[PDB]
Amino acid sequence: TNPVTVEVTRGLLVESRHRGAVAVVDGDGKLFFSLGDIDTAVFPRSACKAMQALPLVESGAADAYGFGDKELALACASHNGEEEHVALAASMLSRAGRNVEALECGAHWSMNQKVLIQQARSLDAPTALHNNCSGKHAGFICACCHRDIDPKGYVGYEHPLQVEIRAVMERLTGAVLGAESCGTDGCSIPTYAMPLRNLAHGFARMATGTGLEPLRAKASRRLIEACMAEPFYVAGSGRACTKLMQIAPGRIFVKTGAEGVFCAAIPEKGIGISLKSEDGATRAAEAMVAATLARFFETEETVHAALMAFAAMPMRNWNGIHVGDIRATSVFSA
Amino acid sequence: TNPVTVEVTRGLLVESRHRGAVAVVDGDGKLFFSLGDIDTAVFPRSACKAMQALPLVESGAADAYGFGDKELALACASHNGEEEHVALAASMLSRAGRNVEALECGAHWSMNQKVLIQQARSLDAPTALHNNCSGKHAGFICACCHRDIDPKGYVGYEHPLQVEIRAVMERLTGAVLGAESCGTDGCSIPTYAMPLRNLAHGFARMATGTGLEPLRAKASRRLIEACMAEPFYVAGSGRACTKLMQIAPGRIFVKTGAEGVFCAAIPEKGIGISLKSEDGATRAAEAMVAATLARFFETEETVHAALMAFAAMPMRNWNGIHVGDIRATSVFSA
Numbered sequence: 001t002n003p004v005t006v007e008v009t010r011g012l013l014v015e016s017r018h019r020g021a022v023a024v025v026d027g028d029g030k031l032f033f034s035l036g037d038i039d040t041a042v043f044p045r046s047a048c049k050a051m052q053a054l055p056l057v058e059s060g061a062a063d064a065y066g067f068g069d070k071e072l073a074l075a076c077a078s079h080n081g082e083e084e085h086v087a088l089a090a091s092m093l094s095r096a097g098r099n100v101e102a103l104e105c106g107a108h109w110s111m112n113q114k115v116l117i118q119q120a121r122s123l124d125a126p127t128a129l130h131n132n133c134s135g136k137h138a139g140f141i142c143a144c145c146h147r148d149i150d151p152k153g154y155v156g157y158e159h160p161l162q163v164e165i166r167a168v169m170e171r172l173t174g175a176v177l178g179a180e181s182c183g184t185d186g187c188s189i190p191t192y193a194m195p196l197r198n199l200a201h202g203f204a205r206m207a208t209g210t211g212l213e214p215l216r217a218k219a220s221r222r223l224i225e226a227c228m229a230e231p232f233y234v235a236g237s238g239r240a241c242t243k244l245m246q247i248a249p250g251r252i253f254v255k256t257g258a259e260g261v262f263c264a265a266i267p268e269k270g271i272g273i274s275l276k277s278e279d280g281a282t283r284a285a286e287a288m289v290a291a292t293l294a295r296f297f298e299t300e301e302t303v304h305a306a307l308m309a310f311a312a313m314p315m316r317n318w319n320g321i322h323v324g325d326i327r328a329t330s331v332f333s334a
Numbered sequence: 335t336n337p338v339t340v341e342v343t344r345g346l347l348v349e350s351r352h353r354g355a356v357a358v359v360d361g362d363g364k365l366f367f368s369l370g371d372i373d374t375a376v377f378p379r380s381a382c383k384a385m386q387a388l389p390l391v392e393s394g395a396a397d398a399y400g401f402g403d404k405e406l407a408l409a410c411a412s413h414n415g416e417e418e419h420v421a422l423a424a425s426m427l428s429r430a431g432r433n434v435e436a437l438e439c440g441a442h443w444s445m446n447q448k449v450l451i452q453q454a455r456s457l458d459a460p461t462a463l464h465n466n467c468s469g470k471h472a473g474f475i476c477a478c479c480h481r482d483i484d485p486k487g488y489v490g491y492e493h494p495l496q497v498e499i500r501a502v503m504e505r506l507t508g509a510v511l512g513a514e515s516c517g518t519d520g521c522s523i524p525t526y527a528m529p530l531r532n533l534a535h536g537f538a539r540m541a542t543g544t545g546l547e548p549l550r551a552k553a554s555r556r557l558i559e560a561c562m563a564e565p566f567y568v569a570g571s572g573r574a575c576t577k578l579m580q581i582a583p584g585r586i587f588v589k590t591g592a593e594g595v596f597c598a599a600i601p602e603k604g605i606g607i608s609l610k611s612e613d614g615a616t617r618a619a620e621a622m623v624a625a626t627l628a629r630f631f632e633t634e635e636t637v638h639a640a641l642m643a644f645a646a647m648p649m650r651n652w653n654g655i656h657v658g659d660i661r662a663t664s665v666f667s668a
């Protein structure tokens with residue numbers, strides 16, 4: 001069973017509790033730190049978008065369509081569907097001769113409340129461009145068009161692009177990705193459950209190049225640097241991913257996934273991080289990733305304090321009164 | 335530990351898991367069914383609104399202000415902030431010569447996405463009337479004004495109304511309510527943590543009159559019947575509380591609370607129910623309350639099937655593809 005990783009307090013009592021697992025692995029596969037079950041297969045969901053963006057870069061598509069750090073960050077992004085994000089996704093599809101009609105991810109309203117209010121006020125309905133995965137899907141469509149592969153059905157298990165993605169993520173993680181570990185993701189593409197140990201190892205390899213072909217090392221490093229250089233484009237206004245990567249500019253990589261996943265890397269320390277809140281709560285995964293990062297910056301007061309501000313947070317009610325805290329437990333400092 | 339009460343699946347695997355506690359008690363305090371820890375103090379939050387509506391009824395205020403089942407349901411309600419709910423809260427305050435400016439609960443946008451889209455398109459900003467607790471607070475203000483008590487500060491621990499509420503909830507539940515069990519609620523009023531056993535017992539007494547003074551029995555029955563007669567006003571469009579009380583009209587009482595609480599009653603069976611998802615997820619608490627109710631309707635095939643449809647539900651992605659299920663575990667049928 002997984003330890004209690006996060007507590008939610010009200011008055012003088014714990015009101016709710018989150019259990020979870022955490023794997024921290026270096027480029028060589030060495031375990032630096034672990035909580036709970038890092039050996040049972042868990043769906044990474046959107047947390048592994050940077051891995052799925054390798055076809056876009058490695059194929060030459062990114063360079064052929066003139067993509068910079070903003071486009072690669074958006075390809076790696078679970079974004080808010082702000083105008084900047086929608087404009088860039090449309091720009092990406094346009095350079096490959098496509099538009100919104102080529103996306104197969106569907107439409108949804110922003111999962112940032114303030115952006116949803118803006119969307120609702122200016123649209124009858126969101127489009128597939130507003131989908132948090134529209135950057136990744138435009139990356140997929142660009143990767144296909146550059147290689148004269150028909151993008152139609154790019155979301156399906158048997159499409160050449162999804163065949164390629166299974167191979168790429170097996171090479172990074174050492175985990176086998178197949179039908180028995182496969183589910184359908186939010187955006188209708190395959191998501192493959194794998195141990196947290198493997199997922200963390202894979203990010204440690206993307207961060208360091210350890211055990212990768214040089215082109216894959218270079219593409220991997222380029223995607224990780226793009227996310228850290230353009231953190232707004234990975235998520236957006238009011239988002240943990242964006243704010244966490246603004247604490248130590250260029251030094252911390254993070255990516256949220258649906259159902260309480262986080263992947264992260266500290267390239268200068270050669271470490272990859274993956275974690276799962278067992279109940280699937282985003283708030284627990286946010287506290288956990290900040291507290292896990294904090295272990296590696298205990299000699300930098302300002303960075304440690306900033307990270308602990310996410311590990312342990314005041315909650316305010318509708319009048320803005322402090323009612324309690326979300327707080328990572330003492331297992332992250334043991 | 336608390337047992338695994340709910341699983342969330344994707345493909346052929348459990349993606350996330352919820353642990354929880356459940357107390358089912360009769361009018362006399364006899365335990366009919368239990369899971370996990372029913373003896374540790376948990377915040378009922380909004381789940382005990384019917385208890386907090388007793389001053390409104392017992393004072394004479396409800397009768398003096400001509401409140402029927404719709405107003406009492408709204409006094410007991412965590413509503414969506416739909417125009418019907420807002421209009422009724424404004425009508426309730428108006429009977430005492432009051433309006434939105436007398437509410438101290440604060441404003442918030444709907445936590446129902448469809449209502450939020452409607453709110454965003456029709457309002458610059460929500461008001462305190464849009465607050466899910468605006469009915470309860472209008473009841474509180476009416477209770478004060480009928481007895482010539484100043485409603486100003488009615489949310490404060492030391493206000494005569496909150497003194498009264500501590501007395502009422504102690505007598506129903508047999509739990510001691512004071513500062514050590516006290517936190518601030520979403521709506522800035524006190525919320526008191528108590529064991530689930532006590533909370534369930536309290537609803538069993540409201541449902542049966544067992545061990546209550548006649549006026550309290552009658553006020554208790556009237557609140558429970560109003561919620562069951564006007565279930566839209568307890569919650570609203572697309573809400574578990576509303577839909578669960580439409581399965582067997584007049585026979586099932588349910589009330590959700592923030593952080594994965596549910597209280598319920600089946601008056602004709604003399605049972606009170608309280609439960610807690612340990613992690614605080616609403617989706618887990620909804621599955622749990624449906625599966626717990628289902629145990630008591632195993633000889634009514636139509637009612638059992640309708641309840642099981644809430645205990646075990648398909649989840650669909652943005653394209654409407656079935657990706658997995660939320661399902662109460664087999665501990666609810668053991």
Ligand SMILES: [Cl-]
Binds near residue numbers: 651657
């Ligand atoms: Cl989904």
Ligand SMILES: [Cl-]
Binds near residue numbers: 547
């Ligand atoms: Cl009594």
Ligand SMILES: [Zn+2]
Binds near residue numbers: 046133136185187189
């Ligand atoms: Zn996706």
Ligand SMILES: [Zn+2]
Binds near residue numbers: 467470520521522523
């Ligand atoms: Zn309230």
